Amino acid sequence: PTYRILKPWWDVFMDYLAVVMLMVAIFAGTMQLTKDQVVCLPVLPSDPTGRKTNLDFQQYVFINQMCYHLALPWYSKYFPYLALIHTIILMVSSNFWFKYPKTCSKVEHFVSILGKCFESPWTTKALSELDKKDGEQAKALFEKVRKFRAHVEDSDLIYKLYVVQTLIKTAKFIFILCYTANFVNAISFEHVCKPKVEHLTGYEVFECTHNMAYMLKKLLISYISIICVYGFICLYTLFWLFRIPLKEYSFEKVREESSFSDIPDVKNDFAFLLHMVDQYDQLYSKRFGVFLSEVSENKLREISLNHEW
């Protein structure tokens, strides 16, 4: 959909980290559905030989299942699902600012007019210092730009939505990290089970080993590292957002670089989109700056009059 222009480098990094986290969560869930089980043996009372526990195979399976659903902690068996939920939430928040129909229409119109202005030879002609069809197309594009400016600057939906998105991402990162750091060393290979099934088997205390414990711990460590990198990127994004006020865009640099100084101060969501484009590439921002100048409008009118007369 050619939406990569609106996505800066930190947005791309967040998208790739979200994809990696989703892959990790899917792999962990597949392991949880594949070979997640515990192996439990009863604690017998005090030439080597084996100890006969007098337990059948299905009694052992019953003990394993009971201690898996009672003795094994919730974070040792529901971690991949929580990770999947977190990745889904982050992916939805990342894609939320261009999925709402009003904001989607606004950004689609912005992308269309930016592509028109970038490929318009009139901007190149204005920067260097024609044809009647080119002049008419330039006038139509000027009218579309004026209509877009009158249509977008009144509202502040996109900027507020992006602020809500990044605040939600930061709060979710803080909550996930705080709630995850408490369950790092808690995941252990060995466990003690007291399931109160002495009337079915005859043993009170069992010792269990969780098969998917150390691998789950390593996946947890990797997920913690990746989410810490994601949180650092989110903090940098918030610092960039709060560094320069994006509510208005000053075209002093644009009007000084260009030969036309009649460039108005774009504010609100249009200014936010221009800031995102400038963080992506300054060429489109220069095209929009030179296409917002009234001196260029006078030059286009004079060229059209010379063509007609």
Binding site: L44, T49, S128, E207
Partner: protein, 316 residues
Amino acid sequence: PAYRILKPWWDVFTDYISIVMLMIAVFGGTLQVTQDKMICLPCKWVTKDSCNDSGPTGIKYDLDRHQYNYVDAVCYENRLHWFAKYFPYLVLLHTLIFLACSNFWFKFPRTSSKLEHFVSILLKCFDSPWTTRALSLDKKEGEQAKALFEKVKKFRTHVEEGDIVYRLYMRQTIIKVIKFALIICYTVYYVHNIKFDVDCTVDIESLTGYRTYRCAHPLATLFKILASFYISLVIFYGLICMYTLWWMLRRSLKKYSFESIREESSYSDIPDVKNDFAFMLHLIDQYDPLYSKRFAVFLSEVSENKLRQLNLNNEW
């Protein structure tokens, strides 16, 4: 797509080697998840830290099925070397690092925008009939050629001032070669730990009754074969990366000379570009010299003067 001009033969070879290594990593990870286990039997006669080895009849251990499963799981998680358990995950991480280092300059916008603009401009100049006419017109062709001349001049005055792409490519090559060095150190050092029979002393005598067990690892030989193949592939990858770094550091890539082109062609006033433009031209020459020779027309001032003369001729 259109980025194949930005990938020389060494880049394509490294990409294919990375694809094969990623396939090996996926296969090894599937084997580790599914078919990786450990079959342990106790040693009733123990004389040292390890197990002692000494009609016929079978030896009875008086152990249940789940006691055997418990012994297998404990000796698999405790007394099995970390390299055998985590080989394909480390290989997958290394392949992901290599792919990220290969595609970082294509995904980082500050270099991606410049690269895609250069690719588009080179493709438009290679298909321009004005280049064919000059190396050997309608007013529309003349004005398109003049607009492309102005675009080339703006691109040269915009890109040649910065050398971010060359720096990023050099950093990627350095990271790739040092990662290869670390891999060929640590994987070769830990390649002897992937053995078949392992003796464990996990101290579970209070549950099973035996102290030392001898365990067989069914996927030991296949993991060793995968490790040897991955070592060979990483050796080839490192040799190609060493050649690429030697090519980069053999001559100054931030200064391209059109001496061969200006000697071959009549135009002897082609300017010498620097920074990212020279490096991109060197990459194109390593891909195919025809594109560079065709694009060299748009830099000579004599060609611009001839284009202006033709525009004046078709203007009246």
